[PDB]
Structures are given as C-alpha cells and as structure tokens.
Write a protein that binds this ligand. Sequence first.
Ligand SMILES: CCOc1ccn(-c2ccc(F)cc2)c(=O)c1C(=O)Nc1ccc(Oc2ccnc(N)c2Cl)c(F)c1
Length: 271
Amino acid sequence: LVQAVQHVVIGPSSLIVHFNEVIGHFGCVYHGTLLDNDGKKIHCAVKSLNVSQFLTEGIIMKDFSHPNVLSLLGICLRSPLVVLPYMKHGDLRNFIRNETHNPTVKDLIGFGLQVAKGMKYLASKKFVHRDLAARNCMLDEKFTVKVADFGLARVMYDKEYYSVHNKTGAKLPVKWMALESLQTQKFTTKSDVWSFGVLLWELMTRGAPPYPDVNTFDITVYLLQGRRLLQPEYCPDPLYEVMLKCWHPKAEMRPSFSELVSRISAIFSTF
Ligand SMILES: CCOc1ccn(-c2ccc(F)cc2)c(=O)c1C(=O)Nc1ccc(Oc2ccnc(N)c2Cl)c(F)c1
C-alpha cells in the first residue's frame, strides 16, 4: 500500500492552506496553493477530514483522466487533507438555481450530455458512483462539468436528502436511489443510470427538489405503484422519454451510458 500510494502523497512542506479563506461538520474546504517542483504554483481547494480505505480511494481517483471527471492533485498526511484543482463556479445545482444566471434550454441539455460522457468513462472502468446528483457535479472556469463526490462533507447541509444506515453506516440519498437499491442496499452501473435520470430532471427544472410532496417512507410504495417524476415545463418530449427509460423497474431494461450519450447528442444538436 505504501509503495502504491507514493504517486498520490504530497509532503506537508509543499502545501499552503489558506485557513482564513473558507470555501465551505465532517470537514471544511479552504483555498490553497500547491508548490509544484516541476512547474508553476497551483490554486487549489483543500478538504480536511475530521484511513486504509481513504488511501485506496486516492489511488482510484488518481487513475482518472477525462475532461468530465474531477481529478485529484493528491493527499497530504501529517487530520488528512485532500487536494483538488479549484472549480471557479462551484457545484452544478447551486449554479443553475442562481437567479442572476441565464442558461439556455440547450445549455442545460449540454450539461446533461457532459455528465453522461463522464459516467460512460467511469462505467467502462467498472466504477460504481453510488451518489450521482447535481450537488456532486462541479463547474470550472470554462463551464466544463466535472463528475465528483463530496463524500461526507455536505451530509449535514444536505440533511433533508441523506439517510445513514444504522448497521452498514452507508450514505443513502433516498430520492435519487433505484427501486432495487431501496429494497436491497445494492448498487450497480444500472442503479447509477436511474440516478442520472433524476439528475436530468434537476437540470431541466433548474434545481427543483424531487418528489417535494412525498414522505421519505412513502417513496418505495410510490415507485412500486408505477408513479414517477412529472415532465418539467421546458423539457422536450424526447428528453422525457429518456428519463422514463432510466427509471424502468427492471435494471436490465435501462439504457447503457453509451446509448445515453448517443440519444442526448441527437436531442442537443437536432431541431
Ligand atoms: C480522496 C477522497 O475524496 C474524493 C474521492 C473520490 N471522488 C470522486 C468520486 C467519483 C468521481 F466520479 C470522481 C471523484 C471525489 O470527488 C473526492 C473528493 O474529495 N471530492 C471533492 C469534490 C469537491 C470539493 O470541493 C471543491 C473542489 C474544488 N473547487 C471547489 N470550489 C470546491 Cl467547493 C472537494 F473539496 C472535494
């Protein structure tokens, strides 16, 4: 493990944490400066963790290289610190909810296509996300969407959406979970497809909360009855058909991420 983690570990002398520049219970995010031995100084975001599994997550994230997936600059051991490239426009949900922003109907479909591309890359590597949602996607200075996971850093802020299992300790985002995951607590690439369907609905409503009139406990019965999220006012009919296929009760009937990239590219560029 020590030899395997060598390329991910950053020395404490190489990282400058700007503690008086907070970005945002389980950890704080601050502005930072990373001192690169072979290039220019890097502006970063540093997340503090208030151990063996953590370093293996570091090795997996360091192997990611795709314009639609958040990369890892490294990990600093001394509380442990996670070093990420800085994302100028924060999370995707807060960006589209901002009343001073004017994304077009095509721009919103475009953000959906970017997520599908990042997920197609992850699924080809057999990586299961388990928490795909607009709040976990980042936006850089060039408006490029980066698929990521805050982990436990926003569970208290997003307390309305998260359940924590009393036995396994698992993070459970009930209103983004596939029917079979709510019944078995098992996650697959096909249950990530269901979550992507919910993410598309969030984009086309500019960040509205899903099922606002349905109790947490009533979600399983609501879904077994065959009921689903309603078509947003400015969501095109072919894009709603895509959402409905992502929510099929049989995991095997749901489209692959390759089929999603193809259908959304058609919707995005065709009239
Ligand atoms: C090493 C363990 O951590 C992981 C592990 C896996 N993945 C992961 C999981 C699935 C994927 F597909 C890809 C990556 C992660 O995303 C993280 C993580 O820590 N992400 C994280 C994200 C945003 C943060 O906040 C920022 C950052 C930059 N700019 C601004 N403005 C803000 Cl607010 C932040 F601090 C930390």
